[PDB]
Amino acid sequence: AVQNDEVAAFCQSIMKLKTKFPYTDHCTNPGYLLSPVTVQRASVKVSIEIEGLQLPVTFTCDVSSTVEIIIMQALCWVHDDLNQVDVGSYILKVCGQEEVLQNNHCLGSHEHIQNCRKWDTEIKLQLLTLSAMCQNLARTAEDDEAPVDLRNIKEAWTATEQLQFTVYAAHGISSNWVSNYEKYYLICSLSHNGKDLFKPIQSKKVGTYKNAAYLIKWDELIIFPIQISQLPLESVLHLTLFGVLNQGPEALGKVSLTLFDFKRFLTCGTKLAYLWTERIVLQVDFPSPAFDIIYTSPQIDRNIIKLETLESDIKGKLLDIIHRDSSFGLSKEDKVFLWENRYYCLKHPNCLPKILASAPNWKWANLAKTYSLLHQWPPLCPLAALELLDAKFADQEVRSLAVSWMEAISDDELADLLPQFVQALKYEIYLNSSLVRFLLSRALGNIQIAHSLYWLLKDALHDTHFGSRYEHVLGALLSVGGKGLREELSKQMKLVQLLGGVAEKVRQASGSTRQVVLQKSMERVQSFFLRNKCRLPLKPSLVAKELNIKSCSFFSSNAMPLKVTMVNADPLGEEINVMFKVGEDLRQDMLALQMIKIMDKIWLKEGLDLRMVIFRCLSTGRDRGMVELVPASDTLRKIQVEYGVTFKDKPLAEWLRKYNPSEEEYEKASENFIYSCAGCCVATYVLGICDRHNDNIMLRSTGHMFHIDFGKFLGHAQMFAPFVLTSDMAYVINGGEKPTIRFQLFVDLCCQAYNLIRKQTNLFLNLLSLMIPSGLPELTSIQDLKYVRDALQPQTTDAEATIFFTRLIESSLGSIATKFNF
């Protein structure tokens, strides 16, 4: 009745969000993906295909120069005078990939240019006009006009009535339940900011009702020692059903009711909540007076607190905690102090999460002072504001304000943070929030964000508690996306469903059968591509028209992953090679890759390029997805065995020399290793990945090292080498059997990198904190964050930290560590 109304009110606000995004505005409705940029605080050759010319013009561009001027550098090559050529209309796209470079960004900024530079591959672009550019994903006029398909009052603070409700009954219990369990009981808890207000109240233990084995009837009144006036707005009642077995009691399912609804009215009368195991209806009867109780916020306190009495004596302790890594591990006496001297910290905005976490309580009286500070507070950094969207800050005024600061973030930065933002929706108790409107707004204005949100929300649906919420959010995204986007995403969904069929069919056969099974199973995929051309879900810029069945294969390892080879719909493009894996939960692989990618962004933003391999991985359902295949790369295992057949101190060295024969070619390959290895060693330690052996590490022919398996992750239960540097690796780093200055470089890079991540301890702890609700196996507790914080040693300075990591490296070498110098 009220939840149907909430859904109605949601849709109408989404209908008026759509108004800000007309189909005519190309800015927000391009119809194509924008090639991503990562601002990085140098010459390259680019090869541009131009309409009319038989050969593409190849010239050297300044990496620093903007795409706009490179477009008319290319126009200067064809036209002696570019005054009648309508320079504005022309754009630059990557050859093969239906992604357009951003005109007002440096060429060096673009991820594609960065990648090409790393691999030393050719930058192939195409100069064209947006007329010729494919805009099939663009929204239409139809899409714009289309609708979205997914009495007397007492104010709360006066209400002295006690929070009580009678748990009445659960309906529709299963046959295997009445079999197993003898009696059932509910545990009722009341929380705000994700923390209990009072200890949970347990119900009486009751069997199924007489002459009705589908029903459990308690009909018991539960009374909490709290008045209605003491309840914060975002108060939530949790009910967990337990069942004591016949002949510890087991948690059958959870339910959460918000005590205040979306129009600030206290829940009255009978409320039905549905817990999933199978749909069980649980009835809770709240009191039902002749009057509606509404929540009203505290009266606005208007103050501008300016110059104040200052002391030196305590200012030092103040700036000590201001410049603390995070609000994690902050003791009681530290909080009371900061809270007292909060108005002095007005010149350091990024420490507001530290201040709000130091608040004595969120009592109605103490809110006017909190809101007074908040609405005179300077803007936070988007990445800092993330903390305010976590569980421990449920207040709407905090969250709404966190999202307003968040609006300052770029699409390109947001795109890689979306998993955390999707999880953050679980801490929004109301469907229609500032956060969901923010996400939907960005999705409308950027097709990469919309595309990413789709897959993330579709994975989130599998949450038994929050699956209902995400259903409405994804319905809003798909509706608002338009027919163009929808029809394309449908094709992508069908492709993965087909690739999924063959994947499990392949694994379910014998050795002989496997190769024939694949060739036969792929016929149904061949059929798909004859009636449609599909964009690759992993990288939707690539459009596959046909499958190269003769090139398709399986990787002979334990899940028997597929090697799907599709031919590009663009002849200027290159063949599409992706792996489709089934069985393994690729979400923790996704997180590891994300964390490593963010480490890379941090490093690059401080001018440290460790030449990291950053490959994609997408979960396209439960325990299945596709992984980007890095070309001309093998595992250290295969390298070690193939060149142990032919010495046994230099198998990697002689592998790199095979593909890099000249002195300068081997030099650049050895150098690539040094940098990439340093980055891997740092990442291995900080994220705690102790399953790093010859199979789990991979090496590109260009010299770049990278991890592939992330089964062990946040496993900081290690006995006192985190990472391993074998004699093979050391030989490549040194360029010899005796230590050189190249090892000093490796050690310098490691420590320098380590420290740049230590500087962003807060970000990493926030990013890992927000992924705890995901259900990833290692990430289950805040304690699991402490392990990462301990690895980052925020207490120590860069001097001591360098000494620590340098001792990690000396330990890493192990037996052969004797040869090097302390």
Ligand X SMILES: O=C(CSc1nc2nccnc2c(=O)n1CCc1ccccc1)Nc1nccs1
- Give the DSSP H/E element, type plus range, for residue 74: helix 67-78
Q: Which is nearer to ligand X, 580 or 787 (CB)?
A: 580
**Least distance (Å) between residue 659 CB and ligand X:** 13
Q: Which of 17, 130, 268, 708 binds ligand X (CB under 6 A)?
A: 708
Q: Which of 629, 699, 730, 751 binds ligand X (CB under 6 A)?
A: 629
Does 615 contact ligand X by CB under 6 A?
yes
Q: Which of 350, 441, 548, 577 binds ligand X (CB under 6 A)?
A: 577
How far apart (Å, rounded) are the C-alpha atoms in residues 722 and 788? Answer: 13
CB 694 within 8 A of CB 684: no
Q: Which is nearer to ligand X, 604 or 627 (CB)?
A: 627
Q: Which is nearer to ligand X, 303 or 551 (CB)?
A: 551
Q: Which is nearer to ligand X, 631 or 777 (CB)?
A: 631
What residues have CB less than 8 Å from 305, skipping those under 6 apart? 343, 376
**Least distance (Å) between residue 275 CB and ligand X:** 39
**Least distance (Å) between residue 703 CB and ligand X:** 15
Point out which residues pair with 605 in neighbouring strands.
none
Q: Which of 631, 644, 775, 777 binds ligand X (CB under 6 A)?
A: 631
Contacts with ligand X by CB under 6 A: the residue count is 12
Q: Which is nearer to ligand X, 575 or 606 (CB)?
A: 575
**Least distance (Å) between residue 615 CB and ligand X:** 5
Give the 3-state secondary structure of residue 457. helix
How far apart (Å, rounded) are the C-alpha atoms in residues 210 and 207? Answer: 9
User: Which bin fits 659, alpha (ψ -120 to 50), beta or left (φ > 0)?
Assistant: alpha
Does 658 contact ligand X by CB under 6 A?
no
**Least distance (Å) between residue 640 CB and ligand X:** 13
Burial of 365 (0-12, 13-18, 19+ CB in 10 A): exposed
Q: Are strands 624-628 and 617-619 parallel, antiparallel or unpaired?
A: antiparallel
Q: Which is nearer to ligand X, 40 or 577 (CB)?
A: 577
Contact string (CB under 6 A) for ligand X, positions 664-703, x = contact: ----------------------------------x-----
**Least distance (Å) between residue 677 CB and ligand X:** 17
For residue 495 the two structure tokens come to: 């492709």
Q: Which is nearer to ligand X, 46 or 698 (CB)?
A: 698
How far apart (Å, rounded) are the C-alpha atoms in residues 648 and 575? Answer: 36
Does 256 contact ligand X by CB under 6 A?
no
For residue 277 the two structure tokens come to: 């195991």
Does 724 contact ligand X by CB under 6 A?
no
- Give the DSSP H/E element, type plus range, for residue 610: none
Residues numbered 363 to 402 that lie near ligand X (CB under 6 A) are: none
Sole window of 170-178, 452-460, 530-538, 631-639 interacting with ligand X (rule: CB under 6 A): 631-639
Does 559 contact ligand X by CB under 6 A?
no
**Least distance (Å) between residue 400 CB and ligand X:** 41
**Least distance (Å) between residue 722 CB and ligand X:** 22
Measure Cα distances from 345 to 275, 372, 740 in Å.
Answer: 45, 15, 49
For residue 413 the two structure tokens come to: 């930065």
Query: What are the two backbone dihedrals, phi and then psi, of residue 373, each rounded to the nearest 5 degrees?
Result: -65, -50
Report helix angle 3-17 to 434-445, nearest 10: 40
Sole window of 312-320, 496-504, 602-610, 630-638 interacting with ligand X (rule: CB under 6 A): 630-638
How far apart (Å, rounded) are the C-alpha atoms in residues 270 and 261? Answer: 14
- DSSP per-residue letters across 145-178: HSPP---EEEETTT---EEEEEEEEEE---HHHH
Measure Cα distances from 821 to 73, 199, 671, 747 in Å.
Answer: 52, 58, 21, 12
**Least distance (Å) between residue 118 CB and ligand X:** 15
Report, in angstroms and rounded to the nearest whole number, the Rg of the chain calculated over CA atoms.
30
Contact string (CB under 6 A) for ligand X, positions 737-756, x = contact: --------------------
Contact string (CB under 6 A) for ligand X, positions 474-493, x = contact: --------------------
How far apart (Å, rounded) are the C-alpha atoms in residues 779 and 773? Answer: 8
Sole window of 321-329, 346-354, 376-384, 623-631 interacting with ligand X (rule: CB under 6 A): 623-631
**Least distance (Å) between residue 579 CB and ligand X:** 6
**Least distance (Å) between residue 548 CB and ligand X:** 11
How far apart (Å, rounded) are the C-alpha atoms in residues 462 and 622? Answer: 8
Q: Which of 351, 401, 630, 639 binds ligand X (CB under 6 A)?
A: 630
**Least distance (Å) between residue 627 CB and ligand X:** 5
**Least distance (Å) between residue 597 CB and ligand X:** 14
Does 555 contact ligand X by CB under 6 A?
yes
Distance from CA of residue 172 to its chain's centroid? 37
Q: Which is nearer to ligand X, 310 or 645 (CB)?
A: 645
Q: Which is nearer to ligand X, 262 or 706 (CB)?
A: 706
CB 234 within 8 A of CB 197: no
Q: Which of 557, 718, 780, 795 binds ligand X (CB under 6 A)?
A: 557
CB 690 within 8 A of CB 718: yes
Q: Which is nearer to ligand X, 297 or 577 (CB)?
A: 577
CB 680 within 8 A of CB 723: yes
**Least distance (Å) between residue 709 CB and ligand X:** 8
**Least distance (Å) between residue 557 CB and ligand X:** 4
Q: Which is nearer to ligand X, 463 or 574 (CB)?
A: 574
Q: Which of 13, 633, 696, 811 binds ligand X (CB under 6 A)?
A: 633
For residue 293 the two structure tokens come to: 């109780």
Residues numbered 52 to 81 that lie near ligand X (CB under 6 A) are: none
- Give the DSSP H/E element, type plus range, for residue 318: helix 315-322
Does 635 contact ligand X by CB under 6 A?
yes
What residues have CB less than 8 Å from 170, skipping those under 6 apart? 184, 215, 216, 241, 280, 281, 282, 283
Q: Which is nearer to ligand X, 173 or 698 (CB)?
A: 698
CB 589 within 8 A of CB 730: no
What residues have CB less than 8 Å from 93, skipping those under 6 apart? 32, 35, 99, 100, 101, 125, 126, 128, 133
- Give percent helix, percent strand, percent coil of the chain, each to the nearest 5: 40, 20, 40
**Least distance (Å) between residue 641 CB and ligand X:** 11
**Least distance (Å) between residue 679 CB and ligand X:** 16
Q: Which is nearer to ligand X, 252 or 627 (CB)?
A: 627
Q: Which is nearer to ligand X, 372 or 676 (CB)?
A: 676
How far apart (Å, rounded) are the C-alpha atoms in residues 115 and 110? Answer: 9
How far apart (Å, rounded) are the C-alpha atoms in residues 805 and 18? Answer: 52
Q: What is the DSSP letter of 28?
A: T
Q: Which of 425, 591, 627, 767 binds ligand X (CB under 6 A)?
A: 627
Q: Which is nearer to ligand X, 352 or 630 (CB)?
A: 630
Contact positions toward ligand X, by CB under 6 A? 555, 557, 577, 615, 627, 629-631, 633, 635, 698, 708
